[PDB]
Structure 1
């Protein structure tokens, strides 16, 4: 009789990242319990630049301090943008889905360096340091945050427990819906800091199960330029299925 290799979800998710030849961690939180998966668990408590995951907090700060509203159409004023898909007028929510950096740079400059630093420190997000460059501090430093801190943050958002008004948190959640089917909802925000070394990739969000249970997640991995952006979504969805969260 031969031996049989027994693949549990811990081993499977570890090998998902190995198969992509990179280091990654997946942080899961539900019922105030955090579990770590992937092939590089030390990443969970390591600080990285948040990249576009910071758009969640940018939106919260801008709406709470009445620098914008959910119906405002941010105009494309004619510069060549990184993607043709971004060259249009759009709302905060559409810019969230597209990760349209110039919309959130315009918002960050409305907030201003002083109010932004104060609010980031009030929330206590990551190292809570934004430096002197108001339009890129989440992309190239100095702001950094751990994956555990991101799962804690996004779980509070999902439960309307952040120190913001309830309506503002509800509105930002609505900007983050990615998928609905069979009574499940998946919310989240990607990030990819391409201009630092090593590059860092994020997918932070939560699943609402059909009975209303919230299972939050923060995927964090080393990126390389040859990777398709969808690698983050692929690794997340395969892992969530292995964990029976979806």
Structure 2
């Protein structure tokens, strides 16, 4: 696991990005734009995690509620179905989480966000878009620390709420490993920012968190972040 082979994976996708890795409060940067690790970006679909936690803890919803699709045209055609808060996490279904956000309410949402101390902790005034176009911005280091506390069940929420949000985030379960995470893509700011923040539950239960953050372009496949990460964690010998 050399910090150079990982520069070339990023050199080669013609992007600019950083991979933050945390292993029990020790943090390392990999990639080819390590200055991104201290830069504030909008969270995007990654804030869904803190939204779910805030919504469940405050009983504005539950893991069994079905969100009804009331007919309107949506940005992706898989989002056009009734679905649970968990299935909306998998699909990054923004309408579901905007409905949750409006139940929470601006006052409650600002209070929770400030208490947790997520990013700049600014949510401004539109309770249903602040993670997508600001004013909320967070750095990739701050992200990997949040997602680290969530894997270790050390966030300021009930034990059962964190477990619930954790179970919404499984991505690949091969070789006795488990990779949890949540993708993101702010395709509406210049330049576009792509996220991938999660952790690896190694077979012995040791927990290694990651926040991949890269500038995006409209032609890249969704699975470019998956591809970059899965092959980076292979290099550092985490899988």
* Same fold (TM > 0.5): yes
* 1:237 counterpart residue number: 230
Deviation at 1:20, TM superposition (A): 1.1
Deviation at 1:132, TM superposition (A): 0.6
Deviation at 1:181, TM superposition (A): 1.3
Q: Secondary structure at the match of 2:195?
A: strand
* 1:127 counterpart residue number: 120
Partner Cα distance (1:183, 1:220) in 2: 26
Partner Cα distance (2:28, 2:155) in 1: 22
**1:176-199, CA deviations, whole angstroms, 9 ceiling, x for partnerless residues?**
001101110000000000111111
Q: Does 1:224 align with 2:195?
A: no
Q: Secondary structure at the match of 1:219?
A: strand
Give the unaligned 5+ runs of structure 1: 1-7
**1:157-206, CA deviations, whole angstroms, 9 ceiling, x for partnerless residues?**
00010000000000000000011011100000000001111110000000
Number of matched pairs: 239
* 1:137 counterpart residue number: 130
Deviation at 1:216, TM superposition (A): 0.4
* 2:80 counterpart residue number: 87
Deviation at 1:149, TM superposition (A): 0.2
Root-mean-square deviation (CA, aligned residues, Å) is 0.7
Q: Does 1:15 align with 2:8?
A: yes
**1:121-143, CA deviations, whole angstroms, 9 ceiling, x for partnerless residues?**
00000000001111110001110
Deviation at 1:226, TM superposition (A): 1.2
- TM-score, with structure 2 as normaliser: 0.99
Match of 1:178 among 147, 155, 171: 171
Partner Cα distance (1:194, 1:24) in 2: 15
Deviation at 1:9, TM superposition (A): 2.4
Deviation at 1:22, TM superposition (A): 1.2
Partner Cα distance (1:45, 1:17) in 2: 18
Q: Secondary structure at the match of 1:104?
A: helix
**1:36-73, CA deviations, whole angstroms, 9 ceiling, x for partnerless residues?**
00000000011100100000000000000000000000
Q: Secondary structure at the match of 2:132?
A: coil
Partner Cα distance (1:100, 1:129) in 2: 23
Partner Cα distance (2:132, 2:24) in 1: 31
Partner Cα distance (2:102, 2:24) in 1: 37
- TM-score, with structure 1 as normaliser: 0.96
Partner Cα distance (1:116, 1:194) in 2: 24
Q: Secondary structure at the match of 1:138?
A: helix
**1:88-131, CA deviations, whole angstroms, 9 ceiling, x for partnerless residues?**
00001100000000000000000011110110000000000001
Moved beyond 3 Å, runs of 4+: none
Q: Secondary structure at the match of 1:206?
A: strand
